[PDB]
């Protein structure tokens, strides 16, 4: 069997011995959680309530509680996301190439096809915030159905419905096609949000920060403080571990009273 440890029995926190130090005697000190970085997402109350009427007015929030339960609904993220959207789609915006080259660029920037949820950016049937007005992309529409439909639609939907604003702007998309258009007044508005860039800005709030030697030292304790991966695992039986806490309930208070008993009595008879 394996009993007591045969070795240095170095501490989990990684501190040295000696006088005027946290640790005095050599030991493991596995129970000492104070030295270990832990969050505080709860709340603490006061020791005395001066108010006459019993009320929970002593409850206070913790500093780490605000960041422990965030919400992706704050207003100051949409503005930043919109700006990054324009800078992320610049490769295809200034790509004065054919449809084959433009399509490939958009595919890498946003994976989308059959059986996948795409953002709809770049598709002919989508509204985009273009710098200047431009006509829709009516190149993909059939020519046989539009020509036969232009006569049956009538004057109501041939010169006042869509053609009244189909050539108001000088610029156009995919060349020009005055013959082929959409007589019906179907507005292709609305869009969809991205799943890659949106998830990055949302998580940005979790990494924000608010005779001396030239070069600052790097104590070992620092490493183990935050990181929990490099820390030795527990080996003692759970039963013993749990019993240690119970022992301290009545032991600890006695030590505090024993110290002040001598100091207080000395002053009452000599001082």
């Amino acid at each position: 069997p394996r009993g007591s440890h045969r070795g240095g029995v170095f501490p989990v926190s990684g501190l040295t011995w000696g006088m005027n130090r946290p640790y005095l005697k050599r030991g493991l000190y596995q129970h000492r959680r104070d030295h270990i970085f832990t969050p505080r997402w709860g709340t603490r109350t006061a020791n005395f309530n001066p108010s006459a009427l019993p009320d929970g007015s002593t409850r206070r929030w913790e500093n780490d509680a605000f960041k422990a339960w965030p919400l992706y609904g704050l207003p100051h993220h949409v503005k930043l996301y919109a700006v990054n959207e324009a800078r992320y789609l610049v490769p295809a915006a200034r790509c004065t190439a054919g449809p084959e080259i433009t399509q490939y660029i958009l595919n890498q920037l946003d994976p989308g096809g059959a059986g996948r949820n795409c953002s709809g950016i770049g598709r002919p049937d989508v509204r985009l915030p273009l710098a200047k007005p431009a006509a829709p992309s009516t190149t993909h529409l059939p020519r046989h159905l539009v020509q036969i439909a232009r006569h049956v639609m009538g004057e109501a939907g041939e010169k006042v419905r869509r053609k009244a604003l189909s050539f108001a702007s000088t610029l156009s998309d995919q060349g020009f096609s005055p013959d082929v258009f959409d007589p019906f007044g179907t507005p292709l508005s609305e869009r969809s949000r991205i799943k890659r860039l949106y998830n990055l800005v949302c998580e940005a709030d979790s990494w924000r920060v608010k005779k001396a030697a030239l070069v600052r030292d790097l104590p070992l304790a620092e490493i183990l403080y935050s990181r929990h991966t490099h820390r030795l695992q527990s080996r003692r039986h759970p039963f013993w571990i749990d019993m240690g806490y119970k022992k301290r309930i009545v032991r600890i208070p006695y030590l505090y009273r024993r110290r002040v008993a001598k100091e207080e009595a000395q002053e009452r008879e000599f001082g």
């Binding site: 997402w41 709860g42 422990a68 339960w69 610049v90 890659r196 998580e203 979790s206 935050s226």
Partner: protein, 198 residues
Amino acid sequence: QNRFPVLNTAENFRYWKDRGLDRLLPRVFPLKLPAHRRVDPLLREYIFFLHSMDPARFSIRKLGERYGLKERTVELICREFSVAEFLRRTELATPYTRRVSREKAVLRMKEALFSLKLGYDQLGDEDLDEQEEHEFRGFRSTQDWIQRQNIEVEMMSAFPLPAKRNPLPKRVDVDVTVHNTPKLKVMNWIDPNDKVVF
């Protein structure tokens, strides 16, 4: 030196990560919580009722689509609700005095604290089906266990290069049930390596 404006490059991989002296810096992180507990308790009762009323019209999959819940998550809501109600109607014991491990006790405290700060969720926010996306899930994701290699080296040429050797599936033994009786359970051992089926 090179142009590649995308979000799956070597430098862009694992965005918002400490690379340098900031690794040792302490940082607070959000506390995870299961979806089946963040939903409004009120809605849980409603969902359970439907399930128990008409399983045919209200199937496990159809019920979760309206409220945006996964097939696995919705199953736990009915199971956890059932037991809570059973002990109350029968006058056996109160939920608060119920015996349970310490792992669940801490979870209950987080659930109450989650709503006290933000509030309960009226409707779940999760996708029913998965989607193939580039994400970092552990250290076993960015590794090839078949060829046992990290760096792929290939010849640079415009002409068609010969393809690589495809892997074969691993044949393992399995078991099936043929006859089941209250006093006996018969099973069959399948051996895919046997040439003769018979």
